[PDB]
């Protein structure tokens, strides 16, 4: 049931067998204990979901031509009216912070109090209104695809952060620079990712 | 020769032979070559 | 008869002894039923100067 190997010929860890996204990846023997393994599993799942959300925001700000993700929250610094999808919401920044902190507080308070491992990982019910998880085969297929795209998005978020920390150009500008002259425009040409080129 | 070279093999003579060898090696290095500070070949 | 073989190498697990977790050679084991019948001899002296000591049955096991 393993979905591949992170290295052909690696030592098969016995504590990652019946889990989605199993590549036998870890060589540091992390999550040997079952409870710590489940805690790291749910932490990875919700971290990758937040990585989905962040990558979606950072890409939809580019493909819609509405600006860049980094100067999007600069509206509070200059104190002008914020814009989202050309709607011009009138809410004040302090009200945004208050409603965000109370909404995320109630969300993570109701989420943490499930007190059962399977629904702490995969709750279902109200959070799954489409109901495509009726059969186990498609359910585990979508589990594998979700975990794969989630690990990819977790890499992508740090990629966006490092790309903006190196150069001030947006994501699409960096993609076009690597498309035009990859040998002349990459992470090794800026001279800041690796010391002394 | 065996009876004398058994005494020759004890620690005080070894306390000289290593000392003479290393000391003379450092004297010849500091003599033929001048006093350097940097190992820039 | 009740202790290890004479001349066999044994390990001492007495905590307060100088030869804790060391290897000694059995020189004699008393059969009269005394407190410390297993008498062993060590190659290295202690701080006092002696090289032999006696231990009980539970303080002597074979080293690996």
């Amino acid at each position: 049931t393993r979905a591949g190997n992170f290295a052909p010929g690696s030592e098969p860890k016995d504590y990652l067998e019946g889990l989605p996204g199993n590549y036998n990846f870890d060589p540091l023997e992390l999550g040997k204990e079952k409870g710590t393994l489940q805690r790291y599993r749910e932490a990875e799942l919700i971290h990758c979901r937040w990585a989905m959300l962040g990558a979606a925001g950072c890409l939809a700000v580019e493909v819609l031509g509405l600006g860049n993700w980094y100067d999007a929250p600069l509206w509070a610094v200059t104190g002008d009216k914020p814009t989202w999808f050309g709607i011009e919401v009138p809410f004040d920044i302090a009200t945004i912070l208050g409603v965000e902190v109370v909404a995320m507080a109630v969300a993570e308070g109701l989420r943490n109090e499930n007190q059962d491992m399977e629904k702490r990982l995969y709750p279902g019910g109200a959070f799954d209104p489409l109901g495509f998880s009726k059969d186990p085969k498609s359910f585990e297929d979508k589990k594998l695809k979700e975990l794969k795209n989630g690990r990819l998005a977790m890499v992508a978020c740090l990629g966006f952060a490092g790309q903006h920390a190196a150069t001030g150009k947006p994501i699409l500008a960096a993609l076009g620079d690597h498309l035009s002259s990859p040998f002349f425009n990459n992470f090794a040409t800026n001279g800041v990712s690796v010391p002394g080129l | 020769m065996k009876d004398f070279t058994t005494y020759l093999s004890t620690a005080p003579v070894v306390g000289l032979g290593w000392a003479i060898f290393t000391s003379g090696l450092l004297i010849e290095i500091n003599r033929f070559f001048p006093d350097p500070l940097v190992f820039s070949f | 008869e009740i202790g290890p073989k004479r001349g066999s190498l044994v390990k001492v697990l007495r905590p307060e002894s100088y030869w804790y977790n060391q290897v000694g050679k059995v020189v004699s084991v008393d059969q009269s039923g005394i407190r410390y019948p297993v008498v062993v001899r060590f190659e290295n002296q202690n701080y006092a100067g002696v090289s032999t000591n006696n231990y009980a049955l539970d303080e002597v096991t074979d080293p690996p």
Binding site: A7, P8, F183, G191, L197 | - | -
Partner: protein, 226 residues
């Protein structure tokens, strides 16, 4: 088994007497190859040091030989790095070093995992289906796509002869590269110019004549001349 001897009359180590090896001459006075797969790891280290030394020396002499004959204007090896970098079609040094490091780490990662478990890279459905021939038949001798001409599927007595020829030319190029760096360090000229100097004038063109290799020997010559 044992063929030849690096030093006739010397005491052979016990781990090198009855050992079936490519180019074994009993040359291990330090007894580094006493343990068995420790010698297997150092066999792979010797093979992979020699194979890149073969390509390195051939990349030095053959362009150097053609430079002497005047066919190509390829520069010397020690200044070839600055020649390409200062050119107008130069990939930057940081990009080249990162690409070399990334490509070799992927290659040497497969080579490493082959060493720990032999034949472990032949697991199906890993390298797009062509990893079935990626099983190493011998430590340091993978075969498969690395021998596409079928020059290893021959008689066994010819195989160790080819292995002996590989390690012998491998060691010879390996001391050659040390000579190449030493001769650039002392004379400051390429191996082709140094070879022509020794052929045309052997006595006055010697490492003993140059004061870099043996310091103070030129002062002995000057003191004896005066």
């Amino acid at each position: 088994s044992m063929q030849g001897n690096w030093l006739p009359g010397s005491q052979t180590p016990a781990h090198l007497k009855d050992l079936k090896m490519a180019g074994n001459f009993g040359f291990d006075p330090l007894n580094l190859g006493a343990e068995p797969q420790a010698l297997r790891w150092y066999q792979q280290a010797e093979l992979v040091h020699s194979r890149t030394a073969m390509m390195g020396v051939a990349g030095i002499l053959i362009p150097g030989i053609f430079t002497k004959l005047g066919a190509l204007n390829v520069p010397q090896w020690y200044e070839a790095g600055k020649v390409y970098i200062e050119g107008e079609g130069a990939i930057p040094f940081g990009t080249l070093l990162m690409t070399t490091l990334f490509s070799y780490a992927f290659v040497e990662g497969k080579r490493w995992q082959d060493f720990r478990k032999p034949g472990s890279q032949a697991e199906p459905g890993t390298f797009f289906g062509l990893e079935s021939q990626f099983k190493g038949t011998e430590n340091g001798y993978p075969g498969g796509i690395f021998d596409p001409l079928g020059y290893s599927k021959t008689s066994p007595e010819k195989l160790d002869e080819l292995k002996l020829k590989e390690i012998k030319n491998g060691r010879l190029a390996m001391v050659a590269f040390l000579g190449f760096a030493g001769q650039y360090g002392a004379t400051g000229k390429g191996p082709i110019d140094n070879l022509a100097d020794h052929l045309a004038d052997p006595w006055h063109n010697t490492f003993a004549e140059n004061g870099i290799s043996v310091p103070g020997l030129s002062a002995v010559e000057q003191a004896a001349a005066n």
